[PDB]
Copies of this chain bind each other. A is one copy, B any other.
Amino acid sequence: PLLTIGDQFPAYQLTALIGGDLSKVDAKQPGDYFTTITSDEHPGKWRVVFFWPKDFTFVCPTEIAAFSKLNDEFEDRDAQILGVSIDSEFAHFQWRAQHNDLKTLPFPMLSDIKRELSQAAGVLNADGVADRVTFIVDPNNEIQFVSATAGSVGRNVDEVLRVLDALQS
């Protein structure tokens, strides 16, 4: 049972790898790459939440490119993109530090390491990992879009932008 339209998106408080070029961050401690992100953190913004099963699985260069080009377009619409898997924050870091496409990913990656958000959202599947699910959550914390896909169907980020746009009009 996936949370649907009209449902409150779950509360969360999770460690996250920061967005943006990791080589551009200073480096006084490992903790500098990392941050806590909670559901109370941009009051009045839309949140576009991407779940996926496992770090280190094939992603399309075009899909990662689409995130960078479409970044201003999401920001202009008061929408904060957030990625979530149950991988640890060090797995997130390692994925973004070693795969040239992922180097400049502009948004944070949350580590749902106790699996509490995936569970509460209805996305935790039979393999023990989040399904590939996108949610759009409005400023009242209400889901206005959910999309779930099996297997390894690529995300169409432009379509999720289209929906956000149409939701705000």
Binding site for B on A (CB under 8 A): 1-6, 54-57, 87-88, 90-91, 93-95, 98, 113-115, 122-123, 125-129, 131, 143-154, 156, 159, 162-163, 166-167
Contacts and interface: CB of A to CB of B under 8 A. Distances in A.
Chain A interface, >50% SS class: loop
Nearest to A90: B56
A91 B127 contact: no
In the complex, the count of this chain's copies comes to 11
A12 to B, nearest CB: 14
Contacts of A95: 94
Nearest to A145: B149
Contacts of A54: 88, 90-91
Contacts of A145: 148-150, 153
10 contacts: A1-B4, A4-B122, A6-B150, A54-B90, A56-B91, A94-B95, A149-B163, A151-B166, A153-B163, A153-B167
A167 B150 CA distance: 7
A113 B90 contact: no
A27 to B, nearest CB: 14
